[PDB]
Amino acid sequence: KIHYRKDYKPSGFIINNVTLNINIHDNETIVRSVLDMDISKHNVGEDLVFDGVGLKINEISINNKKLVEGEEYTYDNEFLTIFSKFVPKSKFAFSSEVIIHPETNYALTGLYKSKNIIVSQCEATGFRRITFFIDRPDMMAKYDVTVTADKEKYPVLLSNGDKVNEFEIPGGRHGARFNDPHLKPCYLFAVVAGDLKHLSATYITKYTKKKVELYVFSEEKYVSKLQWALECLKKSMAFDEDYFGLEYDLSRLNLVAVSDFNPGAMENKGLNIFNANSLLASKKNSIDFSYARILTVVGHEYFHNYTGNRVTLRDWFQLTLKEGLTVHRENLFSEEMTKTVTTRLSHVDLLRSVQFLEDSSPLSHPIRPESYVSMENFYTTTVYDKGSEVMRMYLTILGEEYYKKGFDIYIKKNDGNTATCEDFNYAMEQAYKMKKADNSANLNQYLLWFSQSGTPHVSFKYNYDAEKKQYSIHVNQYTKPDENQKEKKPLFIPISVGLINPENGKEMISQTTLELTKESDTFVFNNIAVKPIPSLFRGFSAPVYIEDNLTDEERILLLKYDSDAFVRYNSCTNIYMKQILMNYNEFLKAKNEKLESFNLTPVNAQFIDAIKYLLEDPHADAGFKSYIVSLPQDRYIINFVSNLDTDVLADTKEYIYKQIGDKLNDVYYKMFKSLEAKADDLTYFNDESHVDFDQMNMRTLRNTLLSLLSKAQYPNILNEIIEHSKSPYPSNWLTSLSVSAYFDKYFELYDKTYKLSKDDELLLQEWLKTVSRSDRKDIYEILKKLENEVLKDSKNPNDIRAVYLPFTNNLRRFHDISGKGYKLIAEVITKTDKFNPMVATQLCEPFKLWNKLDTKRQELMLNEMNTMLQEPNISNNLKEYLLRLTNK
Ligand SMILES: NC(=[NH2+])NCCC[C@H](N)C(=O)O
Ligand SMILES: [Mg+2]
Ligand SMILES: [Zn+2]
């Protein structure tokens, strides 16, 4: 059954209070539930229908009167229908006792066992797997939750909000009772039972001076990995205070790491639950990236407390309202915390590769979809990441002071309520009127960012009149029609711009934002003393394809002299893309025409010089440098190529890297050696409260250079690889594994890094990813080895994703023209779907680009997807996904 956005209608029922008793035993969990309910003003005498999936009914009652199956109710394992003539016409209690089995719940939705922890995950529709409910986010209620369990196995019992009681129960059990005073949707319900250890701290809110207890929890083995998360939480709270004026609203906030988790984390009120890989780190047992990830995910979940929890969703179509906005808030936070331009660049990199691919695929949707079958399929980079760019554009358009004003209005007006995207636009519109000093100004056109799918293309033409000192920028926008809209409309696109004097490299104007609201416009600048080079979409100011129509000479000048990190990075990207497209077509023609000989265009020599120039500048960001010596992502490139022959693209990238290395490899080696002391310095190695993001960037750079030098078989590089493997930083010694792929020492380092990894669950998963990603001719045999020796029969999403996903990025081998990469992943998807549909769909990622490949590869991918579609008992989740991806 399809849900349509336009069909939204309030429930004919109200649920005011939920009182739960959750009694956990080894071989069953019993859930007793009383809902204090009422008839809404929208009620039209309908049956009372509860969602309830996979529940075993012991009893149901209305008002102390037992209801009888086949007489008063029916239940079909998805819906409990109570016939209207038995439903009261005023306030009443509904109560039920059901049996569930977390110990056999491998889908990790509802209540499940993760190792030795019992934990819930209810977003989006998991609560119906715990007990009967009207399981939709506009049914808000207050929760009174008792959990009971064996004391010895489950000494720590948690649910949302204030703990009001703990008590002994005969038989060696105990119970804990919680009251959450805040109205919430059921998706924000959580419970946890485990032998948990913690770190804690106290935080005093900035304005009202509330004392808040902060606890972070994990299994005993990993308690020493909790400290950075606790520091990140404090940073998050301070930031929401300082930037947004927002204070936490409960006496206690708990974060809990679990080993088996589908998402990254979950913002349950007062009880945030994390994938361990996004909560736990230590410097001896985690890669550098873990520290940024944890800062990101802790901040994200914390910021949900307002954007998601205190203001929640009217319906699931509004998902981007909490996810887009929360990602945006986390981006501001992370950028402020890390103080490196690579934070913003990394987000742009992900948008323009993964999200752009999505937006040009058959899966393309607007950030607010018009329909769904399974909401699970819309936790997408479109909803999260394009969402965040749409939320960011408000700040770009309004500026900080007015943005904060509009956000305040949003919070003030909707606090304690459900909300829609229109509510957020309305608030921003008020700030807009205030800023334009004009009560007739409006953001009606802005709404198109929510409803219209596809990436806009913004293109540029220029005129300089030297006599008048007058510069003109003519801008055009175009969105390609697709299955969502036959006719696309012009968006409100803010374009942040500067102008660079190419003669001296200086800024010629104060940075300004051009507001393009039409299909095209011409913006004219007076008193421009020399012909400038434009610096366009600074900070990446809108989520668009940029066609700068600049020469490579001009891009090089921007790369060298522009102040904006994005424009420099993008100028580099465009130079690479021109070269890739040229060399790709040259190889392609030679192949197609079976030429005995042909020419390749060399890489621009002034560009190579500019790379040298930047690398040798010790004041330039090391993270930025690592971007400039790397070609654009395959998934970014594919947006510019029809009928992509992956082997030809692989040859193209190889040729380009070789041409650059022939000039730069000695410089690369020099830098690798000179960066070492600063990069690998052990300051803070024992301090999980301090992270030097600049130093981490230096390590990234060194590892990037080592990778380039290894691929090139630079003289005696193996010696440096071996030495690198003895570093205390896992980022280094895991790099040494993957760069050794090109040498006979690979399996030696394979074994060594395994032994270093095998005793830490999360580090082992990093090791798995490193092997999966290894550039090996025998990679298929290696995957089999991983299957038989390490992964075996694991149902842990982290393990499965670690083994297979990174491999699918192997341009040469995953896309083997035999189709054996496709067949391998399809088999895994089908196997996984039998116990965890959510993860099965995630594993489909590689197929998203099927219709962009050459005809043979298209056919092979299509064959595998149609095969998956034919599997008996295929989940709704996977079926919906694959039917959409294959155009029906
Ligand atoms: N169906 C899902 N994938 N749910 C994941 C929920 C993640 C959580 N709402 C967050 O983004 O912080
Ligand atoms: Mg069941
Ligand atoms: Zn979120």
Side-chain angles (χ1 to χ4, degrees), residues 1-887:
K1 212 211 199 263
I2 312 205
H3 292 68
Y4 291 99
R5 183 177 71 89
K6 65 180 165 70
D7 283 344
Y8 170 79
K9 186 80 199 300
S11 188
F13 303 98
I14 305 170
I15 303 169
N16 291 137
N17 295 268
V18 176
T19 307
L20 292 180
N21 282 257
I22 297 172
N23 312 115
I24 300 170
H25 294 261
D26 287 342
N27 293 119
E28 54 169 25
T29 288
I30 304 148
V31 181
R32 283 195 301 285
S33 188
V34 185
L35 317 177
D36 292 292
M37 290 188 61
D38 198 358
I39 303 306
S40 87
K41 69 207 212 280
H42 301 101
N43 184 280
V44 305
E46 66 266 47
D47 294 333
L48 174 55
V49 184
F50 294 105
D51 300 292
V53 173
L55 312 178
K56 294 293 187 205
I57 295 176
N58 274 354
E59 50 196 286
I60 61 184
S61 305
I62 286 170
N63 285 338
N64 281 322
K65 176 214 168 55
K66 166 208 189 38
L67 302 184
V68 174
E69 191 287 316
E71 312 254 2
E72 283 112 44
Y73 79 85
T74 194
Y75 179 55
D76 69 2
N77 273 281
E78 269 191 37
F79 298 103
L80 166 66
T81 300
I82 297 143
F83 308 121
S84 47
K85 66 202 248 173
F86 307 102
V87 184
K89 295 161 177 190
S90 56
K91 283 176 112 105
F92 65 95
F94 173 84
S95 81
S96 70
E97 186 183 292
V98 304
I99 301 189
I100 58 188
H101 290 99
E103 71 282 1
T104 60
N105 188 349
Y106 306 111
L108 319 187
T109 175
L111 189 69
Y112 65 99
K113 195 159 170 293
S114 167
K115 216 180 272 189
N116 294 316
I117 299 165
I118 304 284
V119 58
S120 59
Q121 169 57 29
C122 291
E123 183 172 7
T125 56
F127 190 76
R128 61 185 71 173
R129 291 170 168 262
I130 301 174
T131 185
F132 294 110
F133 212 70
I134 306 173
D135 185 356
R136 42 190 278 179
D138 66 340
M139 301 300 296
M140 301 209 286
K142 288 168 62 163
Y143 285 63
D144 170 355
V145 180
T146 299
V147 192
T148 72
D150 186 77
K151 194 181 339 170
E152 196 170 25
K153 311 154 58 74
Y154 303 115
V156 183
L157 302 176
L158 300 168
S159 193
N160 309 93
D162 303 336
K163 180 144 112 143
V164 297
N165 201 18
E166 20 197 338
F167 52 94
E168 299 289 289
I169 299 166
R173 294 174 67 75
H174 72 134
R177 187 170 193 157
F178 296 81
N179 288 356
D180 181 357
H182 294 287
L183 278 186
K184 64 169 181 281
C186 59
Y187 83 83
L188 286 178
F189 166 86
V191 61
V192 179
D195 192 1
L196 297 175
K197 307 303 164 179
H198 67 274
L199 311 174
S200 65
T202 305
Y203 189 95
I204 299 128
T205 67
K206 183 176 174 189
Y207 303 108
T208 58
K209 309 291 184 195
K210 213 210 207 300
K211 277 230 188 43
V212 187
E213 300 310 303
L214 309 183
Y215 282 67
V216 299
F217 287 90
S218 74
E219 62 174 294
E220 178 175 8
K221 188 177 162 153
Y222 298 122
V223 78
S224 71
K225 298 178 80 172
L226 288 166
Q227 177 60 68
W228 175 239
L230 180 55
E231 286 308 313
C232 289
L233 181 53
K234 292 185 272 193
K235 288 164 154 47
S236 298
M237 299 182 75
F239 186 82
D240 226 0
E241 288 174 335
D242 297 340
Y243 195 94
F244 288 107
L246 296 180
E247 297 181 295
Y248 191 61
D249 57 344
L250 285 163
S251 288
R252 174 117 159 209
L253 176 56
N254 304 311
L255 320 185
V256 179
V258 299
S259 292
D260 306 89
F261 209 67
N262 285 336
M266 180 59 215
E267 71 267 21
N268 318 105
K269 185 75 177 185
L271 180 47
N272 295 357
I273 300 180
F274 293 74
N275 196 308
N277 79 11
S278 299
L279 197 65
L280 303 181
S282 80
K283 288 187 190 177
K284 136 220 216 62
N285 291 317
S286 313
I287 63 171
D288 290 347
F289 176 65
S290 278
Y291 288 87
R293 174 69 177 169
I294 290 151
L295 174 72
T296 279
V297 176
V298 172
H300 183 102
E301 303 310 328
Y302 180 76
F303 299 133
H304 267 319
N305 195 53
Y306 273 83
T307 51
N309 299 1
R310 288 183 67 100
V311 182
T312 196
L313 309 185
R314 186 196 72 174
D315 59 74
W316 286 116
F317 296 100
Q318 317 301 323
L319 183 61
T320 202
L321 180 59
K322 80 175 173 78
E323 294 309 340
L325 183 51
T326 299
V327 172
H328 165 58
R329 278 143 65 55
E330 179 272 323
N331 288 356
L332 293 174
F333 169 59
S334 282
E335 280 166 51
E336 166 82 19
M337 291 304 106
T338 63
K339 317 265 193 237
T340 60
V341 293
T342 68
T343 299
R344 177 72 178 142
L345 297 179
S346 72
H347 189 76
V348 174
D349 208 64
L350 180 76
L351 188 85
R352 303 205 299 180
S353 55
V354 186
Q355 197 279 321
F356 279 16
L357 182 178
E358 185 163 273
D359 228 345
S360 65
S361 79
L363 300 174
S364 185
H365 47 289
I367 63 168
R368 178 161 73 179
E370 281 308 319
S371 77
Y372 67 84
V373 171
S374 165
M375 237 337 262
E376 302 308 308
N377 283 332
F378 290 90
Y379 288 72
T380 58
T381 186
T382 295
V383 168
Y384 276 65
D385 298 306
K386 188 182 170 170
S388 71
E389 293 307 293
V390 171
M391 290 303 175
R392 189 185 183 270
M393 279 186 285
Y394 283 123
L395 169 59
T396 297
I397 292 167
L398 288 172
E400 171 168 324
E401 160 179 6
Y402 285 108
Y403 175 72
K404 287 179 168 171
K405 284 200 194 294
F407 187 89
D408 194 43
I409 286 160
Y410 172 61
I411 289 302
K412 273 191 329 228
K413 198 141 211 191
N414 301 281
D415 198 17
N417 294 338
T418 65
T420 64
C421 297
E422 272 86 358
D423 292 325
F424 192 86
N425 199 59
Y426 174 87
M428 292 296 134
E429 197 177 79
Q430 305 320 108
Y432 193 62
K433 302 205 212 235
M434 269 164 126
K435 176 197 208 250
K436 298 246 114 117
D438 185 1
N439 264 55
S440 69
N442 74 63
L443 292 182
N444 274 332
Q445 173 182 14
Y446 201 89
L447 281 179
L448 292 170
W449 280 113
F450 293 87
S451 62
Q452 189 171 277
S453 62
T455 312
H457 299 247
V458 182
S459 55
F460 292 89
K461 298 283 177 69
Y462 313 102
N463 188 68
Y464 184 63
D465 189 275
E467 299 76 37
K468 301 179 198 94
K469 308 298 191 263
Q470 196 171 73
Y471 187 61
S472 299
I473 303 175
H474 180 79
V475 192
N476 188 92
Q477 72 168 287
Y478 166 76
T479 305
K480 188 172 191 223
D482 57 22
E483 310 279 352
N484 304 318
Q485 288 95 23
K486 282 171 191 200
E487 291 168 12
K488 299 285 189 185
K489 293 176 63 55
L491 305 179
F492 189 142
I493 300 174
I495 317 175
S496 300
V497 304
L499 298 176
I500 299 309
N501 180 333
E503 201 280 329
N504 68 6
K506 312 289 280 172
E507 311 273 339
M508 303 177 74
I509 60 164
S510 288
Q511 181 169 309
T512 183
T513 302
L514 311 184
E515 300 186 350
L516 175 71
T517 53
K518 297 189 275 174
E519 172 178 330
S520 73
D521 212 333
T522 298
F523 303 85
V524 186
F525 298 86
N526 279 324
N527 298 310
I528 306 304
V530 164
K531 195 195 175 212
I533 301 175
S535 170
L536 295 169
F537 284 105
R538 285 189 162 179
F540 192 56
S541 65
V544 303
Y545 289 106
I546 303 171
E547 289 144 37
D548 68 15
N549 285 136
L550 294 178
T551 64
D552 277 358
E553 187 206 60
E554 285 164 324
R555 284 154 177 169
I556 290 159
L557 285 174
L558 285 180
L559 172 57
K560 298 181 64 160
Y561 300 112
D562 200 0
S563 62
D564 188 64
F566 169 73
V567 179
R568 305 176 71 189
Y569 157 99
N570 191 43
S571 295
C572 189
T573 302
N574 299 341
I575 294 165
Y576 276 134
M577 282 304 302
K578 192 180 204 272
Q579 181 77 31
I580 289 154
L581 298 183
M582 187 68 104
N583 290 149
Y584 175 86
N585 285 304
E586 293 166 339
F587 274 122
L588 185 65
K589 279 165 212 195
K591 185 182 179 162
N592 281 352
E593 306 182 6
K594 313 246 194 136
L595 294 189
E596 272 295 288
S597 70
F598 63 101
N599 279 254
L600 292 160
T601 306
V603 177
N604 182 313
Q606 280 68 61
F607 175 53
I608 292 165
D609 282 337
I611 296 172
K612 189 169 181 274
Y613 174 99
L614 290 192
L615 285 177
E616 288 176 353
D617 181 354
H619 294 302
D621 194 270
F624 176 74
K625 295 177 188 195
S626 72
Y627 277 114
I628 300 306
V629 304
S630 302
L631 264 61
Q633 293 270 318
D634 298 335
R635 281 177 287 190
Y636 179 76
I637 295 154
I638 188 144
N639 290 305
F640 299 86
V641 178
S642 295
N643 300 313
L644 174 85
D645 182 325
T646 49
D647 282 317
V648 174
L649 176 58
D651 298 345
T652 296
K653 290 192 128 187
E654 203 172 272
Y655 168 69
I656 295 164
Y657 272 126
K658 198 248 171 208
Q659 297 303 103
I660 291 162
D662 276 351
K663 280 172 201 216
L664 291 192
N665 276 346
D666 289 343
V667 173
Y668 287 170
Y669 179 73
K670 179 144 104 80
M671 307 210 43
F672 174 85
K673 301 297 291 184
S674 76
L675 278 167
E676 195 282 318
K678 277 172 201 280
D680 293 344
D681 180 89
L682 293 167
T683 306
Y684 296 136
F685 203 59
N686 197 41
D687 183 356
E688 294 291 328
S689 265
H690 285 101
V691 170
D692 186 334
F693 283 98
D694 194 33
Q695 192 197 16
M696 285 188 10
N697 280 349
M698 290 177 173
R699 292 204 281 280
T700 298
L701 180 54
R702 284 192 86 232
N703 284 322
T704 298
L705 297 177
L706 185 56
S707 181
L708 291 162
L709 291 165
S710 304
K711 292 192 212 148
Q713 307 277 294
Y714 192 78
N716 292 111
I717 199 65
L718 185 54
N719 286 145
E720 262 97 20
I721 292 164
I722 296 311
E723 274 321 295
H724 208 54
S725 77
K726 304 166 177 175
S727 170
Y729 293 95
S731 285
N732 296 338
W733 60 256
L734 286 170
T735 293
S736 77
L737 171 61
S738 64
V739 301
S740 74
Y742 304 112
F743 297 89
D744 58 348
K745 255 49 178 153
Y746 175 74
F747 281 119
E748 184 170 309
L749 284 169
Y750 181 101
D751 287 332
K752 167 188 166 105
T753 61
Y754 177 76
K755 282 148 200 158
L756 293 174
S757 301
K758 64 191 181 54
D759 291 319
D760 182 300
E761 158 180 289
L762 294 176
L763 187 58
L764 184 55
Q765 293 161 6
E766 288 313 326
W767 177 88
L768 288 167
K769 289 199 278 204
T770 306
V771 174
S772 193
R773 205 171 19 83
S774 289
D775 194 5
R776 290 290 298 187
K777 298 206 154 79
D778 51 351
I779 191 62
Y780 283 89
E781 290 65 35
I782 291 161
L783 289 180
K784 216 122 76 244
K785 195 178 167 68
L786 287 186
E787 272 156 8
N788 298 335
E789 279 176 20
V790 181
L791 180 66
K792 317 208 210 290
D793 289 298
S794 182
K795 293 204 215 308
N796 180 284
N798 287 0
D799 293 336
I800 301 161
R801 291 185 290 233
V803 173
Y804 299 105
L805 279 186
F807 163 68
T808 67
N809 297 126
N810 196 312
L811 181 60
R812 234 188 249 288
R813 320 272 175 216
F814 172 65
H815 292 282
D816 188 278
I817 192 60
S818 77
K820 74 170 163 174
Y822 308 154
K823 182 177 158 219
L824 186 145
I825 195 57
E827 286 178 348
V828 179
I829 290 155
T830 297
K831 181 180 133 138
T832 304
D833 191 56
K834 293 186 190 321
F835 64 86
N836 191 329
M838 273 165 246
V839 175
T841 299
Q842 286 161 30
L843 296 166
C844 283
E845 185 87 0
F847 290 102
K848 286 164 102 199
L849 51 55
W850 74 272
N851 67 343
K852 288 175 166 72
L853 306 179
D854 60 84
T855 132
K856 290 173 74 177
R857 275 175 185 100
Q858 275 196 51
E859 179 178 15
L860 293 168
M861 280 206 164
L862 206 33
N863 285 354
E864 294 303 328
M865 288 182 281
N866 288 322
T867 297
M868 291 186 282
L869 270 162
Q870 285 296 121
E871 300 296 318
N873 285 185
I874 186 173
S875 62
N876 289 338
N877 231 303
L878 180 58
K879 186 194 198 181
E880 184 201 4
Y881 194 81
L882 290 180
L883 294 169
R884 281 217 286 134
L885 185 51
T886 63
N887 294 135

